[PDB]
Amino acid sequence: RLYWDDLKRKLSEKLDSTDFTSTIKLLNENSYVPREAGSQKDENLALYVENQFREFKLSKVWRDQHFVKIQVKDSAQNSVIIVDKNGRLVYLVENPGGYVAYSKAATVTGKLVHANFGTKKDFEDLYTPVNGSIVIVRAGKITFAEKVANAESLNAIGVLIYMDQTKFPIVNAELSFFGHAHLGTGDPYTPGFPSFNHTQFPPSRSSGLPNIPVQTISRAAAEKLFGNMEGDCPSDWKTDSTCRMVTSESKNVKLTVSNVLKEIKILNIFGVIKGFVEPDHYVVVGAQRDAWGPGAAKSGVGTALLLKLAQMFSDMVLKDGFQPSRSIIFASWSAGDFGSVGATEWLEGYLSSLHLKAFTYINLDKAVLGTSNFKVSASPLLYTLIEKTMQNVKHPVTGQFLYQDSNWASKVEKLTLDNAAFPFLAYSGIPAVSFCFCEDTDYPYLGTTMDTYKELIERIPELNKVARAAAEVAGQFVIKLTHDVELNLDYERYNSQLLSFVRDLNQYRADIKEMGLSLQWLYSARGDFFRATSRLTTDFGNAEKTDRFVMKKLNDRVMRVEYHFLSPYVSPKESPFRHVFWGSGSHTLPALLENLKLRKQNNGAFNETLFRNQLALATWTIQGAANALSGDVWDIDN
Amino acid sequence: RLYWDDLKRKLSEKLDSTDFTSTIKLLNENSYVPREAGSQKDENLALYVENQFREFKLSKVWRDQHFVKIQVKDSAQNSVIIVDKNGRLVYLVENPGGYVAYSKAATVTGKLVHANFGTKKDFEDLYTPVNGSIVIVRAGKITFAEKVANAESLNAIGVLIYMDQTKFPIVNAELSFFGHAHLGTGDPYTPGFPSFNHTQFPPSRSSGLPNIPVQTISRAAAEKLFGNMEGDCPSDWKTDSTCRMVTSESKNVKLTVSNVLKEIKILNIFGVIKGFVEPDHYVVVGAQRDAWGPGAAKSGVGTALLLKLAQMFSDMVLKDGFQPSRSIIFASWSAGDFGSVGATEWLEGYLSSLHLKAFTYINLDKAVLGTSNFKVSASPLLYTLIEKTMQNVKHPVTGQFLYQDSNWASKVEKLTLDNAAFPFLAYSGIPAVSFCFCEDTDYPYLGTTMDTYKELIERIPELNKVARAAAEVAGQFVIKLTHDVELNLDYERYNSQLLSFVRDLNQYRADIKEMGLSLQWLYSARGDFFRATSRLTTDFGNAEKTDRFVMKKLNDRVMRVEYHFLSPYVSPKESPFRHVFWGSGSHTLPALLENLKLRKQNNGAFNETLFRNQLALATWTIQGAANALSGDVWDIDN
Amino acid sequence: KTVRWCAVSEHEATKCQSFRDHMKSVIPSDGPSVACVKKASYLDCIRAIAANEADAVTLDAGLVYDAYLAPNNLKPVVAEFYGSKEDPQTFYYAVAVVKKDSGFQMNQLRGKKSCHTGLGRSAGWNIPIGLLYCDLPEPRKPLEKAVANFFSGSCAPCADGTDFPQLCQLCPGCGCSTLNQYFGYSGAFKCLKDGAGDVAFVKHSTIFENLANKADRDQYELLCLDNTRKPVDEYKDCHLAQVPSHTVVARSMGGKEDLIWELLNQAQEHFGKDKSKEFQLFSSPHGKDLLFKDSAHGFLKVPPRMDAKMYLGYEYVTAIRNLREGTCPPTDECKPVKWCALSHHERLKCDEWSVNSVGKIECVSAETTEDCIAKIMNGEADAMSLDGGFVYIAGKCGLVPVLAENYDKSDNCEDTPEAGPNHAVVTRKDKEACVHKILRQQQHLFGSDVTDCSGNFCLFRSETKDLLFRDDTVCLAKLHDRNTYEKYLGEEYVKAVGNLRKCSTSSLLEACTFR
Ligand SMILES: *[C@@H]1O[C@H](CO)[C@@H](O)[C@H](O)[C@H]1NC(C)=O
Ligand SMILES: *[C@@H]1O[C@H](CO)[C@@H](O)[C@H](O)[C@H]1NC(C)=O
Ligand SMILES: [Ca+2]
Ligand SMILES: [Ca+2]
Ligand SMILES: [Fe+3]
């Protein structure tokens, strides 16, 4: 009855009549001005969205309530001061308004070294040893948790995070920001398992939790610190001319953090539209609802895009007659500010119920930050679906299409820990996507209270149009993923990914040979994988698209593709991000190479015993993912 | 065309014309007399079975070759002697002909205490402390590995295993036996991953490997040891009147084991008959091929039953016109003597390829040992399938049916580590079954070289008939599992299993309450599970059996049932037997209770922190297994 | 044994029982017999043979594509020939028939009314629409909705009337049966002669099957590719494209290819053309083109090896798949050349090369040297090295060599070719440009290199002996001349292997030399 083009057009029309700005402002009203996860006002917007979903007359509307532990600044405000060698001295630098959730909470004192961004590479180039000293960094180089993680590895005492004026063009230099340092997804006190009264909340501590205090300070506060510091910072790093490398031997800084953890009631509001051909299979669309400050850019826009997309698709079904082959779930997560907590609890919670039932995830968080370029980070399995959408949707400002860079696939960057999509792909093994109408430079007031509607609508005049273009891209991802019998997942995309891996590992073939090791098995592992997809491709080509049975047997195999890249061997609890390509730790393909790089310097940082295993598990994992994809167990000889 | 009854009859007829004894003797010929895993004669029988399968004109015949590490007795024979307090003294006790694979291989000397069977319960009742002393035990109480494991826990120096005359009515008191002490399944040097050149065999050591020497000795040898020991053994244990509790303070034993590990080429021969409705889904039938000694009872019978069943079913298809809905795989494993090595390598190896493709496993090892009673240990999901078969097959001696004990379900015992089926159920999450025409007392020469065809046919006159009755029971399991659209797996069986768990845990509700804990969540967890199966039951009742699509969605859900009981949280590598009900370690339901029992004595053996987690993960695991079974994710409110 | 047969509509069902009664009169000498199964459309017949209900039914080359797809899996066993029994033809001409003095040409077909033989049929849909798809106004998919807008009125047999109202403007319901006046070759012509459509896409023999008067035939003209019009009688000089003849299909496994051909070869002698006065297999008073095509003059055996995608050939299979996806093609960017390996050692050497080539070369595996050749044909593979003998086998299929393995060392190896014959790198027609380019780029990266392979990769050296290429090869010379299997093997060697193939015949050679 209704084909793609008829759906594309019906979507565009619905978009034209939809007013986004009006919704984004309504979510910024005085009743929703403060959204801190677990607040009465967080729940306020929770009920709203729920009643809104119910109003859209969706097939089903439910809610999950978790009791996770976050962290807050109590009556005992933290403080950063510079002291003398014998004891307290110098002057009070600042009384932080903002903090860093999941900080060790303690009082430390010592020299202050500027580690710049705080990248593992930044520390290695530092001429000043970071051991036994407090380090100060600039945010956005890597997640807040990684800055603290990389510093603690080199035995730091504490960490200070600020926003220079170069990377952050903010007038008010007294403005403070918020963030968390947990190198983990979701609640950190129920690592690897769902937070529900059901579990009785047994004593459990995430390994991603830092053992060092972390505090945020305003630009002015850092400049005050630079005044007591000497050593001009390298031009290499585009930074302020205020920046100072280290403190004088006479005076050092004394950081005191006393954050206290709090138990809150988080709410996840959902809405599901059942498909007609396959009710059980479903794509998930989500958006963060909570926000430390007003959060218009952080959550305002996303939650707005969620409400409208749930609206536009409910209309296309109820009214227009749009028939979805697979269900579509809309999720409004909370506790996002603390690390995709809300979402990750849901994943850890209904993993069994979504094993191979959920085939993709679309995240709406931070979809609108600028207007210059269009950025998207996701699983290769969606690269094709994206590319086809890029050349279908037109930029909100310039009339040209989003598809301008042919080799854009090669410029795509991994999904990070702060992205709500990360948990889905690296932990659950569900292909995820995260697009953005980004700007060359990140949004200034992203964590600041400055992230109001006025500030957003001012930095982005045509906000409504950009929000529509956004909703459109996500809207087509849904139409493509649930529309027709074929699943728009392109398992073939990965061949480039594996080829890249092996090519980088082939460079170190000299060291491989020196050890009792051959690299021939990985060559075959990749080849076997390619022939596996090729056979799958032909198996699709030699099939009757209308036959429900022959397609299920072919689409079912395709869905696993992602799952089979989740390393089986590692414990999901201790190492939740099992995916070899996008997860974390030694098991991940990057880790194997990362460790081998140390072998080239002939130092003792390289572990041979570890490598031999990193290699053996990885090669099989690629190898077994290939054996499965073909079609059967008995047929594959080699 | 052909219904059950028509299949039952066509099977019986094929059975009547089939001669088993003749095959069992042919496998005991001089060319197959020694089968030690990896031997030229082991491979001999391997080729035979392969060519035999190919002769049966099966749809596909393949082979897997692993390079696993076993252990053997080298030129340096081990020896057990009694010595004096200052140094060597007393007389040479024995030069063991047989050994215990995977022993620590070292020389130890110390007091000798009789731990009887070596059960964790046996050690607790011992009036003599086992710390810092060599212990002697009697086999069959628990696997060889468990005896060593339980002793090492109480800090033993070494272990001696013998066969008393009571439990073992063997005339020749000089006869020695073989076995392994690895508390693991498959090869112990590739724990949790397949042994293939592909992995390059990275350095890896199983945690199931003992750090204490273990040696087997003949009855006479033990009696010689009892002559130097004092203290009459308790009547509690039905044992010889020779048995002595401990050695005199003047003389103690000195055990010296020097076994050396060897790398061998193991071969797994397979044969697959494709189903017609669902080629991808399949039940697996296997049997051990290797044998330390002649192994007529250990592997002779099983391998014989495999060859014939592959024959009888090939005939029913090629000739009779039997149409199988799902494929059937026949496997001849090797290295079985070392702990289901051959089979477990295959499971670890093609796990991804068999995730939810393999729905059941039928093991033929040790199916014929006696004639008195019929024993069967398997997953509840097969209890009904078994019960229905028991009252369908007639005993080979008495004309009565096998179904004589109504409450037989409650008498069934867990699958053990030495059983080839264990790995399938506890590790892979594939329902497994293992029946037996057993005898009240285990087969005497099971590990002895005494396990010849002459000895078997003599202790079992009507061997052929009993072998046929055996082949028949397994034959119907196959007909039932692949025959019709419904899968003969009874997910409902588990309700009794969970009810039992909760009832035993309810006894300790006093301690639960004392701790900040409520047992209400587990009550619900069980209830939710029951209502889940009930809804599934009705969902089957309210469906058109002829509709291919509605049954797939219902049979697919049923298959997972087993998988969902495999604890997700634990690392498969370190703790491979993830299944909560039948696996190993703290995660398993038994472990949770086992630990809580220590809380009743108010001692420090009970770990509270561990329990709270053992509980939290277990309750969810039961809870999540229930949420999944229903049918969908959105519908379940509670 | 009895060979069931599927019939569509009532007219064909009556011709079926007559196919039964008539045969049993002289039958059965050994065993053959025919049966009759009732079906609404040809789609029901293909689905029936897969369910063992039937055993064989004749399909159009364009409808063969739908029969071999999963789960139908049906391979053609016996193919009918056109023309005469003396000089049989395995390919019929597809042409567009229009009225005289119409004004419309091939390029100007928009708005005009159309009459098609049957949605999916060679002459009726695949060839005629095939050239217009890329010119059609978007959206191109669904292809059916695009045609519904291009033509004003049209009759497409077997088309969805509910989803497409315009496609059944001429013949409501869009019946696929003979019960529908406008169905098949003769049905589309009666859609033109009746003034319902301005054009009818059929076969070159359709004009003679309906009209007998040469004076009545002059009232019609024939459309040509170069936007011209020529007399209908000039079908060879002016036509659209050549397509494979109609063939009977049966299951790939358990379809009884021999028991069906034994029936047809005996049925053409008893109730065939110019053999009997009682019954004719290619003529019936109840309808035209029943069971078989009236234009046919017999049957011919379809080789064993030859499958559905090999019977239609690369040129045609690709064209149908592209027509259904809406793919319209040079950028000269090229695509990774799929190399075909035979043994375990070849793929391993190939895989290590694939990685070293940065994805320029990929690896496809085949069981036998003859099986790799089959994959290069349908598109699963692209190129492989072959010896003189196999080059002749491959050449007879449609693969022309582009590189030669020189063995004599010289200053300029690639520039100057060597006669011998030597090992040649056969490839497909379309992928000849890139193979010629890509493999030439590796020569400078993995060709003549110092004996340091121990660390780096070497293309000509093999772990064992002659894997992907011969070890004693110095370079891969480019054949500047448009060389074929005949132009590369000289002349004497050509006849040599030909006669030797007469006694020692392979399953592939008998397939590539069939049509
Ligand atoms: C869950 O536990 C919290 C304390 O952590 C308690 O306040 C709340 O009432 C409990 N709710 C339920 C349903 O048990
Ligand atoms: C596998 O490794 C063993 C040594 O452990 C070696 O003897 C054998 O030849 C190797 N086989 C292959 C195919 O690599
Ligand atoms: Ca958690
Ligand atoms: Ca292993
Ligand atoms: Fe035709």
Side-chain angles (χ1 to χ4, degrees), chain A residues 509 524 531 542 544 547 638, chain C residues 68 70-72 347 351 455-456:
Chain A
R509 66 184 182 277
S524 303
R531 311 183 187 94
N542 303 334
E544 190 184 305
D547 187 17
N638 276 151
Chain C
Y68 95 115
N72 309 314
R347 74 169 65 189
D351 284 340
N456 306 313

Side-chain angles (χ1 to χ4, degrees), chain A residues 194 200 279 282 569 571 620 633-634, chain B residues 194 279 282 518 569 571 620 633-634:
Chain A
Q200 314 257 245
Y282 46 81
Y569 316 99
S571 170
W620 201 220
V633 269
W634 42 72
Chain B
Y282 46 81
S518 178
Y569 316 99
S571 170
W620 201 220
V633 269
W634 42 72

Side-chain angles (χ1 to χ4, degrees), chain C residues 310-322:
Chain C
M310 188 182 284
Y311 177 58
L312 305 173
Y314 184 62
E315 296 288 62
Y316 190 51
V317 175
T318 300
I320 305 180
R321 188 173 293 118
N322 277 43

Side-chain angles (χ1 to χ4, degrees), chain B residues 126 383 414:
Chain B
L126 284 183
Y383 280 8
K414 309 162 54 179

Side-chain angles (χ1 to χ4, degrees), chain A residues 1 3 5 499 502-503 506 509 520-521 523-524 526-528 530-531 534 538 541-544 546-547 550 638, chain C residues 47 65 68-72 139 142 163-164 321 344 347-348 351-352 354-356 358-359 362-363 455-456:
Chain A
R1 294 286 289 81
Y3 298 94
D5 198 64
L499 197 177
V502 180
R503 188 179 178 65
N506 192 31
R509 66 184 182 277
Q520 67 165 58
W521 310 101
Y523 295 131
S524 303
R526 167 177 173 288
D528 286 346
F530 158 84
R531 311 183 187 94
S534 297
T538 45
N542 303 334
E544 190 184 305
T546 55
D547 187 17
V550 66
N638 276 151
Chain C
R47 296 177 175 177
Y65 183 73
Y68 95 115
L69 299 181
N72 309 314
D163 289 345
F164 310 109
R321 188 173 293 118
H344 174 66
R347 74 169 65 189
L348 187 57
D351 284 340
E352 169 175 47
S354 178
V355 174
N356 273 260
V358 196
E362 308 188 307
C363 307
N456 306 313

